[PDB]
Amino acid sequence: HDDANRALMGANMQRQAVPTLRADKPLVGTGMERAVAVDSGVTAVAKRGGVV
Amino acid sequence: NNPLSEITHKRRISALGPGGLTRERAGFEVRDVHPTHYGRVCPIETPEGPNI
Amino acid sequence: DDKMHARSTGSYSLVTQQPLGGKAQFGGQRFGEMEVWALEAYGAAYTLQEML
Amino acid sequence: ARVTVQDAVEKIGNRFDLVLVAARRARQMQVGGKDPLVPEENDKTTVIALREIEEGLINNQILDVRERQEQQEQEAAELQAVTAIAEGRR
Amino acid sequence: FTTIHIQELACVSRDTKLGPEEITADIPNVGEAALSKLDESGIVYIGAEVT
Amino acid sequence: EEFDAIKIALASPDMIRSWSFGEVKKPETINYRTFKPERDGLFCARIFGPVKDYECLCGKYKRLKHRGVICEKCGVEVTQTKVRRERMGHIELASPTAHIWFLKSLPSRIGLLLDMPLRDIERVLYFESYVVIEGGMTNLERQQILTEEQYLDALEEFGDEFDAKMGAEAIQALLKSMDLEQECEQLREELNETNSETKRKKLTKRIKLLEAFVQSGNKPEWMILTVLPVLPPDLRPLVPLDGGRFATSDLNDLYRRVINRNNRLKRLLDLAAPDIIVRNEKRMLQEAVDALLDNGRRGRAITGSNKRPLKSLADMIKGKQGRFRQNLLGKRVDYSGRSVITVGPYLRLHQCGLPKKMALELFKPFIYGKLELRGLATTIKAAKKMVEREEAVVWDILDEVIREHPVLLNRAPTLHRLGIQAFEPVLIEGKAIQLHPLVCAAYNADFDGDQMAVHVPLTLEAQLEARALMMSTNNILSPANGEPIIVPSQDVVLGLYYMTRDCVNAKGMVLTGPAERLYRSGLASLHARVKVRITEYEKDANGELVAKTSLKDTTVGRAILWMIVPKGLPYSIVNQALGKKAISKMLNTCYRILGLKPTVIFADQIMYTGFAYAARSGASVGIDDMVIPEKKHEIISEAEAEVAEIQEQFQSGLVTAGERYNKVIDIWAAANDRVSKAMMDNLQTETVINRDGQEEKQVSFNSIYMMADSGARGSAAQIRQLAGMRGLMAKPDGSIIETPITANFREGLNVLQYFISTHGARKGLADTALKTANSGYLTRRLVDVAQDLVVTEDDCGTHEGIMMTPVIEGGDVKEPLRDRVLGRVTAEDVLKPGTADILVPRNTLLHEQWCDLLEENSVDAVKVRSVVSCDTDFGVCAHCYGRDLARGHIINKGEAIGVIAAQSIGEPGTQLTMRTFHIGGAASRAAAESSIQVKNKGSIKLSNVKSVVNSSGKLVITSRNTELKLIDEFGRTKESYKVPYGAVLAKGDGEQVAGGETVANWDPHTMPVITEVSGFVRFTDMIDGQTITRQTDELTGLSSLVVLDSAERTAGGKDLRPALKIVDAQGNDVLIPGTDMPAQYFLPGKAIVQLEDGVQISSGDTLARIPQESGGTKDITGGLPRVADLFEARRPKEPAILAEISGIVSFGKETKGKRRLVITPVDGSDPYEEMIPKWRQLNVFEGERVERGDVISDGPEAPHDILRLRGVHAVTRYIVNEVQDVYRLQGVKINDKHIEVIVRQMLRKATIVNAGSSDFLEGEQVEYSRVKIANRELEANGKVGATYSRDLLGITKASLATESFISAASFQETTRVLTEAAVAGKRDELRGLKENVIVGRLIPAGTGYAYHQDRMRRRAAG
DNA sequence: AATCTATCACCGCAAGGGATAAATATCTAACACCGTGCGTGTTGACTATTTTACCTCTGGCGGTGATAATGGTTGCATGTACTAAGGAGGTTGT
DNA sequence: ACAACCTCCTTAGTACATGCAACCATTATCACCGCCAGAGGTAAAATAGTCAACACGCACGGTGTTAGATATTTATCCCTTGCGGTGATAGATT
């Protein structure tokens, strides 16, 4: 439902975005909202697992 | 700026330097799209202005 | 937030006695050739001579 | 008047000679405090300079009429001896 | 939508004919409240606010 | 009294010793255990002055204590550190040596003093060969070259009076023995009866150089110098650094390398070494000198370890980075700043918002400058505790500014005046810049975190002129025409449109009230349909009030606007829907009639009026603001089914693959345009259910439609993509694709529809991001040529002028008389009989209502004054421009037309080469330009008129500016419409109407070119090829003829006037009834004739057309390159000939490249010849025979020859129409008084074609303000002189040699310019604008025009 | 510019809340004493403050080596888009 | 006799505007080591001094007692609240 001239902006505004004091998730989404949390280790993940 | 930006930064694809050209000494060989981009290189995840 | 850059007076380029320019220099900012064309077009000679 | 100002151009018919007449009042206030004949209504010196042609009178162009004649009505008094001075050139 | 940042600023003491250069707080009658926040070595404390 | 201006020559090897003090002898700058900057080297204090302030080396003269001395102990001066800025050094060159800008400077300069191979003059300077120099016991003679291995015995009988020698020494020696008391006077007798051409194309460069040397004080020795002057250290600022490192940069190190090479060349001569080592070191020294001068240009560059070249001396001048552009014509500035723009809706129009700590920063000179002047701090030192604190005492000190102080504001890059304006502070929070909403339009403010800049004026004079000249309230209008651009802005005008729209049911289908508090009484709306008698008034030109009264059909919001409207104009103007389409014209009407203050208040108070109600409209974009036509289903049963058989017809053998591409893309266009019809019924009316008690089929309240009918931001090209079909796109090659988007943004886009339209979007956004340079660089070079037109004078005596017309392309009225004539002045006593037989004398200022009296008589031509019809020296005379368009008055004596006109073209070109191309993801057009329709009960009044009745069934208009007034039952006009010539009427005069009712029509692309009279068809003022060219089709056999006028013609008939005709049973005019004169119908080019001679037709029937895709203030469009040579003024580089002799044509005298045609007149006895290009296509071979210039080949007519073969007013009447009509197709109606500037400044030069006894030569093109020396003394003392004229030199040539030459040095190609400034030893007069920018003076416009008048009574005392 | 009747309400005038200041009682601080120890004084012997003298450091800088060594390096100015100028030379013309 | 003209020769003159962020490296190359300077070292005496001795003598600070202040407690007083009775407002008219 979007023209390329604003899809271009969407592909950059999400990148110009910055950490904030009370951050909150994309409620609408694609599924990448959990991949992009792990694709640089910004969330720690159980590389073996067990009991904390 | 935030995690999504560094995650895509690590997989940026320049068209420049010895093997391509610059922002200045270049036409559309470095800026436009060709159909084999399908499945491979998204035509909207670029900076804006003359950097397109 | 980072870019509140005004100036009364400050740094000067020894190479030309003109202001330096830059936030990283607390500089003075460029009244350009196009900005001169507006004062020329207005017939505003004292505001122009002020910059010069 | 501060609240819009181009009407001082249409008051005369031109726009930069306007600024020379304004400056002729302006310097005589900013470097001489010379007498006004209308108030300011907070149009501070930058625009008291324009007030002079919102009206059309109080630069020295009417001191050239007033104070320059206060001399010359002594020249009229004294004309009875200005003859002897003007005869006494010969 | 308050954001949080971490930024860096630095200084030097050059090789003089002896070797060191000075670092202290003496700037008398120039802005005294903008001095009240410093180490013996003329440096702010970790944990102090500054503006 | 003031120092006048500046003069030039070159640095004579002797005269340098009047400015300098010794050899800058060594490379170093320090000495181990002492800082003492090197005694005799690049920091030689004995040559350049003291080190720390006043400080000599070695002791005894330091601090402010000692000054005006020379220290004994090391021989060093005691002055000040900054004396290192101009106490120059020198270096004695151990060879005569070049200077790069006389050799690498194409055309170059050394050859123009020797007339000997420029290819190898450089080797003679590299000291590779010998030449003969002087004598009277000659045997060889001068300029004979040699090697060196012979000379000997003849010296015993001839060796008293002859000499010959090597290289640069021998060239510099030969340059002693010419005699200017005899050379220059004899170089001119060829001009009597005999002078040639290519030898003139070269040697006039020398003849001009030598005459310019004599008239300016130059000397040819200055080509081949023996001394390098040395850049003063403070311009390359030699100092140490705290990091134990030094300022050794570039403009120091280049001199180390030169000093070293020259100190070897010295030692090698001092020892008389092998001459090999001397020859190599000469070549290495010239290499290092010319690389120090202009590094890189000598086919090589000098570099350092981080690979880079070193900055040359010429990199302070030649290209972009030079002083002219980086430090003079623009520069870094104090009392200034920048920040992000923010909308400030409570700022009144004269105001701007500024954070308290930014006001503190910008006003420090008022604080650290008044505490010490009231006692409000104990000292400026202690005050640090109080000023940085923003303490109470700061704010009296700042109201004493703010309460009457004009801040300046800036939105670079300032391609147009309104990008800079003046205001008044308001204090605020934050870190932004707050910006009044009506000027946000005038700036083009783009709120994506882009910025604006701020400048404080501090002189009393700058503040006086800022309020008088730059203030927003005092510059409201478009300089190109005169609509407001300081204007009710982006969503403000949806509020005003909403207050002025009305509805069915409406919470008030008819209802009224006052009182905003009644929006809280239970039942009200701004769409509720008020009616009220309102007595209403209209100010006359004399100042009285034409009182009126009327019933109204209106709303609460239309009634509230009678609070805001300046009630000296009538309520009935508000009785409409005030979108961006309409609202500007209320303010425009106020400006035309009431006065400035009334028009400002009416613009300002509309702002808050918009903000009170724009929100309460509830207008949105959302999923059911996106309706779709159901009957799209039926349309898909047509278009996709038409394609389905057509793709079989290709395969079964009834189409090829190629026509099939068009024959399917056209069907995709027809599918989009079919759906686009159903779309508008559903979007605008489809409430169907079957009344009574149902079916409110009203005009819709869909927001996406309202976003276009308000003009807020919407268009038909947006609506197609949002309510029916996105349609078609371009590929990266620019042409259309067989792959449509049959869906719209509510139906969706699949991966492929996204991906394909993304290619067109990438191409368009990449052209958006690049093709601006092809307009901005041109705009920069344009101002250098354009500047000098300050309104200086009054009538200039030029009793001549251009025959301008409405824009009538033969078969449309694309611009009426009004818009083009807008406050220009007549040049003849114009009169046209027709309806009121009006006469408008010469020297009358044509404000709009002079045009109204002419348009009733359907006036289609008027001789007017022109910015080209202007004799005035540098400046211009008021009659040539008449009325300013931005301040709005009879144009102020001091207004700078030159820069205003350049800006009026450079901005809209650069603007729309972005604002159309960022859209390439979809394409469509739609139009309605073909009919006129009545809207209420009334009676018809034909006006401005002739009209006829037609045997083929029609009633038709036959006049060029025609109108159709609508009247009530009693005599009140209620509407009027312009109506084209050839428009078919559906009504008679005094007939009756009810509304919903078409009353006139014409072709979608044409007003059909139509007859008054019945007879045979004929042609007149026409010749085939030379005025018209052919087209043909089948069906019955068929014809058409394209008309040709000013881009297209041969020499033999250049200025013909093509005119269709109606005639008797054999011969001549069926004279026009009631105006009994020839029945002849004149046209421009670009129209197309569609009936021919010997055909026979009726009154009110047709002969010609146009393929006019209408453009407009919509659809949109964009482009530029075809404009270029209309301002660079050459010929096509391919002379694809159109022949100059009729019918008898052959080949017969072929030659060693180009063809040679051989030709003869049809009844003559006299053959001629033509040189057609080597290989070029011919559309003819043996039988295909025509008049003087039909399509034998296709070469378009050269723009410079439109001057040479039609004259200055004729060429102006087409350059000021073709470029103008590109901008008219963009909807940008620039008045002709702007493109006339660029034509005046190609006409800046004035040809001269023989010698004399004044300003007179041959082969010359003098600045016109000089050559008037002819009339200035011929008419007073008789003298002797020659033919003189005017030229069409392009911007790339006209700029290179202005008299304001201080400006021209900034043009670029700065070597070509500065070498001519050196050759002419040139001496300025300060008469443009840029010259006084460069010398930091009052610029010769407005408030500095008001100072240049004093200089004009020093230059004229007695 | 004076008159008032007839609004929406402040006055008409009862109640009651907090306040602060009185008196009491607690706190601390200012002092005066005492004791400690340091920087109160001259004298005297020490040893190394400075000077000059002498005997003998560090670093100023001038001077130039020989079994013989005898055709060198140097990499990328730039690929585009324009087009104005000079350069070439044979010749078909001026 | 020269003139420019046909052709592709090469040359080389330019390439719009405002602003912010960053940090300041690579070379090798015998400097030889011989001489001697004023010149480094230091012993013994000038320009003059240390600080330990035994005296000298004083200031300062902490322990003790006293002083009075202050913050508490108490209780008084006034200014304020909220409602009510009915006020001459607001402003239309004289």
From Swiss-Prot, chain D:
GO biological process, one term: nitrate assimilation
Broad EC category: transferase
Entry EC number(s): 2.7.7.6
InterPro entries: DNA-dir_RNA_pol_omega, Pol_omega/Rpo6/RPB6, RPB6/omega-like_sf
Gene Ontology molecular-function annotations: bacterial-type RNA polymerase core enzyme binding; DNA binding; DNA-directed RNA polymerase activity
PANTHER family noted in UniProt: DNA-DIRECTED RNA POLYMERASE SUBUNIT OMEGA
Assembly with partners or alone: The RNAP catalytic core consists of 2 alpha, 1 beta, 1 beta' and 1 omega subunit. When a sigma factor is associated with the core the holoenzyme is formed, which can initiate transcription. The rRNA transcription and antitermination complex (rrnTAC) consists of RNAP, NusA, NusB, NusE (rpsJ), NusG, SubB, ribosomal protein S4, DNA and precursor rRNA; S4 is more flexible than other subunits.
Name the record gives this protein: DNA-directed RNA polymerase subunit omega
Name of encoding gene: rpoZ
